[PDB]
Amino acid sequence: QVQLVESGGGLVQPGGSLRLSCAASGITLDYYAIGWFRQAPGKEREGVSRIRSSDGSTNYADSVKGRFTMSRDNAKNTVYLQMNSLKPEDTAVYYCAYGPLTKYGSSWYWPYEYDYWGQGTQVTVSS
Rounded distance, CA 38 to CA 86, Å? Predict the structure, then answer.
């Protein structure tokens, strides 16, 4: 029942900024992760960032730390990825994905695998 839709892709010049949106519908669980991923030309898909619903905790991939920020509008069921200081090598299809957190002992663990994916949005950083 979960569906995710990415939007906001476009063409931007080197050094520019862009904000992506991931709108989710059908989520009923309280404890879940939303991840951003990307696949560049010639490369495998890689993780970009993730956020969890319980407390808003995040993580970012080494290549984007400080330049990209992932955040939420709970009333719109939406997560944003704000990208600043864009580089040519940030060019990719960007995807968002959903996966439940799972509890063991006293802690909720992030998933390795995500269950539902959007169709992606193209981000091109080029002169």
Answer: 14
